[PDB]
Amino acid sequence: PRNLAAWKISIPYVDFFEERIPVFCIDVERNDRRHEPEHWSVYRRYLEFYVLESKLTEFHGAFPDAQLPSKRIIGPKNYEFLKSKREEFQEYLQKLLQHPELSNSQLLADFLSPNQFL
Asked: Where are the domains of the chain?
């Protein structure tokens, strides 16, 4: 029985994919089963977070306590800028996981599962 509140995540660093596009590396731990629990990593682009927020809020309505900051329209989304947003983005996801409304969210699960948000 899926329960995202029993999933712990962190974004320990920013990496590169394709070494061309910068991405957040999201470590996931899944504790809604099992001694040792399940764990993996996922790589998400800056823009994918905004699509997640758009899609979640469309389906579930807004979350006052969990808001992404304004999307950068003018300027580069390079390594140092992703690095500057790491902690905010980590906190955003962690708060989402504790919303009862999202404890069985397919969007959030897909977002936090390896291998949609374009």
From this structure: 1-118
d(CA 101, CA 106): 11
Could you give the strand order of the β-sheet that contains 38-44, starting from the edge strand earlier in sequence? 7-17, 21-30, 38-44
Q: Among 96, 103, 79, 105, which Cα is nearest to 24's?
A: 79
The architecture of the domain spanning 1-118 is 2-Layer Sandwich (3.30)
Q: What is the dihedral of CA 111, 8, 100, 117, to 10 degrees?
A: -10
| Deposited resolution, Å | 2.5
* Residue closest to 43 by CA, chosen among 69, 79, 17: 17
